[PDB]
Amino acid sequence: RAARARESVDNLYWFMLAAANSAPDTPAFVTRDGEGGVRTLSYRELRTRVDDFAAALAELGLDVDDRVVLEANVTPDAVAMLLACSLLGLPFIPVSPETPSGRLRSILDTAEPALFAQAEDGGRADVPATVGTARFGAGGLRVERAPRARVRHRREIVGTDTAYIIFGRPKGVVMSHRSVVSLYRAILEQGLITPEDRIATTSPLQFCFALFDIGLALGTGAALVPVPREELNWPRRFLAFLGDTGATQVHGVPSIWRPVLRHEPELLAGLDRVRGILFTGEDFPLPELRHLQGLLPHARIVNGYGATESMACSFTEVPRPIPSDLERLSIGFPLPGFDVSLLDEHGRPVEEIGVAGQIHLRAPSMFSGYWDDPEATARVLVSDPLDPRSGRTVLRSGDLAYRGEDGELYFAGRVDAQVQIRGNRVEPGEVERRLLEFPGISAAVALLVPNDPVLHAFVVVFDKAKARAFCALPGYMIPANIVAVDDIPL
Amino acid sequence: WDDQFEAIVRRYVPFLGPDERLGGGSELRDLGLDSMGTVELLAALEQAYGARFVDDALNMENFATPDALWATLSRMIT
Numbered sequence: 046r047a048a049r050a051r052e053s054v055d056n057l058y059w060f061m062l063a064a065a066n067s068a069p070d071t072p073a074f075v076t077r078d079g080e081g082g083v084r085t086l087s088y089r090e091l092r093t094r095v096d097d098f099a100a101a102l103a104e105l106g107l108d109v110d111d112r113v114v115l116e117a118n119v120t121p122d123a124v125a126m127l128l129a130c131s132l133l134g135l136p137f138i139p140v141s142p143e144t145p146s147g148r149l150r151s152i153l154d155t156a157e158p159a160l161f162a163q164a165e166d167g168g169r170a171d172v173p174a175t176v177g178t179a180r181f182g183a184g185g186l187r188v189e190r191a192p193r194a195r196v197r198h199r200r201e202i203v204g205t206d207t208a209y210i211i212f213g214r215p216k217g218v219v220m221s222h223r224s225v226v227s228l229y230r231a232i233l234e235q236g237l238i239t240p241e242d243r244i245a246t247t248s249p250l251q252f253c254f255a256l257f258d259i260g261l262a263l264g265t266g267a268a269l270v271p272v273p274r275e276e277l278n279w280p281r282r283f284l285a286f287l288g289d290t291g292a293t294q295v296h297g298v299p300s301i302w303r304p305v306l307r308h309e310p311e312l313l314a315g316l317d318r319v320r321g322i323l324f325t326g327e328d329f330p331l332p333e334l335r336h337l338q339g340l341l342p343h344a345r346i347v348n349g350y351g352a353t354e355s356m357a358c359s360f361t362e363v364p365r366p367i368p369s370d371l372e373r374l375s376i377g378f379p380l381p382g383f384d385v386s387l388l389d390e391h392g393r394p395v396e397e398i399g400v401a402g403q404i405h406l407r408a409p410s411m412f413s414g415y416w417d418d419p420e421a422t423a424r425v426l427v428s429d430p431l432d433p434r435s436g437r438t439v440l441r442s443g444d445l446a447y448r449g450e451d452g453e454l455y456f457a458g459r460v461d462a463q464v465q466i467r468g469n470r471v472e473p474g475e476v477e478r479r480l481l482e483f484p485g486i487s488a489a490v491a492l493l494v495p496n497d498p499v500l501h502a503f504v505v506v507f508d509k510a511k512a513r514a515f516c517a518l519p520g521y522m523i524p525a526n527i528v529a530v531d532d533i534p535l
Numbered sequence: 536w537d538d539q540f541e542a543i544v545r546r547y548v549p550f551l552g553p554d555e556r557l558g559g560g561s562e563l564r565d566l567g568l569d570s571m572g573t574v575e576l577l578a579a580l581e582q583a584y585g586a587r588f589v590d591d592a593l594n595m596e597n598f599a600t601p602d603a604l605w606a607t608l609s610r611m612i613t
């Protein structure tokens with residue numbers, strides 16, 4: 046009786062498990078056991094796990110469009126769960142075990158999911174009684190609180206159905222199966238990944254980069270090598286994990302490299318199997334990049350540029366070598382099927398080489414909108430200023446860029462105060478608003494201070510540890526320091 | 536723990552007041568020790584002591600508190 050996506054309909058299940066039919070006994074996952082032994086899970090075994098979890102989820106009587114919060118690390122079980130949800134047209138919302146309780150309750154209060162699922166050994170408690178709770182693992186899917194009874198109204202799952210919603214106020218980027226599959230078919234055309242690659246992925250599951258990596262590995266028929274935080278956060282463990290698993294590609298925000306470059310460059314140079322690196326989210330400092338390139342001469346390095354609302358836009362391979370005089374890396378050219386307009390403040394195309402305009406993107410991987418926020422959606426997904434009468438829309442990105450002499454793009458900052466911390470969007474005004482509401486604080490300023498830059502709060506007023514907790518806002522948005530000051534200097 | 540250790544740890548916990556005792560059981564994450572910070576603290580300790588943390592000693596439990604980290608350092612020297 047549960048609706049299931051048909052094989053011809055754009056859907057993460059069919060797209061990411063195609064290799065289960067065409068190459069069943071190739072690896073989909075490489076993990077290392079408690080004894081430092083490397084294990085592989087095939088496409089065949091992963092599909093089997095997805096189908097078992099789907100049979101169990103379908104018993105809960107959820108309707109297509111019903112939301113499922115998945116709290117987990119990037120694990121085979123977690124990816125089976127999100128693909129099981131995909132098959133049944135249950136949009137999933139990824140959250141990490143390390144997500145603050147305050148932040149998880151804000152997502153539950155905003156999304157109103159029918160179900161929260163965590164791993165057998167997850168420690169999340171006190172999920173409100175209006176949300177179903179289940180645990181998944183070796184034992185299958187076990188219900189604690191079944192979701193409330195309902196009538197199923199949706200007969201058939203379609204490509205425009207929501208695959209996932211990525212989350213001061215939690216902003217839900219609503220992404221269709223059609224959009225996500227379109228992004229991957231564009232990338233597949235570039236031959237950037239082969240089924241022979243083993244892609245090390247570093248971002249926790251709640252970040253859009255984790256979903257990108259998952260879909261990139263599985264949709265290509267490649268092996269995903271999730272790097273747990275217990276390896277990632279310790280350069281010598283990180284590097285031994287990449288060696289043991291035989292990672293051929295390593296994906297992560299530039300920050301993942303900074304501790305390794307500073308403290309274990311010799312061991313880094315030993316990663317003879319790494320054939321490529323991909324970074325996105327923020328600028329990679331050029332000295333650090335030149336250092337990395339010098340240590341791993343046999344690695345292609347790709348600069349990916351994109352926002353959550355299209356997932357991706359453009360890339361370049363970094364020039365080999367990086368010229369000494371080079372002031373700024375190119376973000377290269379849009380993927381095939383994507384198109385960028387650079388518009389001035391009047392919506393007019395910027396035609397002159399080297400003059401910045403606001404990126405307006407035409408993409409087959411566009412988000413459907415912001416969860417329950419049609420006003421935010423109308424501000425960002427706008428009438429095509431070059432074709433307003435067709436009804437067609439573009440992503441107004443807030444990013445500035447200019448073109449070079451070959452038409453390649455160059456990121457030129459933003460139209461607003463937005464900064465990146467480890468590739469995470471941050472509106473300093475938001476951290477400021479929050480500290481201004483801490484009892485004692487009359488004025489506040491948050492800025493990136495320069496190793497990687499740190500978020501510093503300067504406040505006019507006091508327990509800096511207590512003001513920290515009151516912030517602890519998402520994780521990456523919590524000041525590395527809160528310094529009381531007599532006046533904010535202009 | 537010796538005066539060198541307190542001074543190094545204090546460097547990586549900006550929410551600890553100059554005037555405030557470094558409590559042996561203080562959750563260093565709650566005093567501002569983050570992912571990058573933790574690796575900088577490791578490197579500072581290895582550098583100042585000539586100590587080597589074996590792979591098994593590089594974990595969040597050993598770096599959670601000054602008392603846990605002092606014992607781990609002490610075990611590495613031994």
Ligand SMILES: Nc1ncnc2c1ncn2[C@@H]1O[C@H](COP(=O)(O)OP(=O)(O)O)[C@@H](O)[C@H]1O
Pocket residue numbers: 253254324325326327328329348349350351352353354376442444456459465468469470
């Ligand atoms: N390669 C890049 N170089 C510089 N800035 C980038 C790059 N990729 C993304 N950004 C910045 O990050 C923003 C998007 O952040 P977010 O929505 O978290 O997604 P992601 O960081 O994965 O692209 C962009 O609007 C831009 O400001």
Ligand SMILES: *CC(=O)NCCNC(=O)CCNC(=O)[C@H](O)C(C)(C)COP(*)(=O)O
Pocket residue numbers: 247248249252253254255298300325326352353467468469470521569570571
């Ligand atoms: C949409 C999207 O995914 N954009 C990129 C967002 N950023 C990332 O994927 C960065 C992933 N974050 C991290 O790796 C963490 O910020 C650390 C670096 C795991 C946090 O370390 P410690 O700081 O707890």
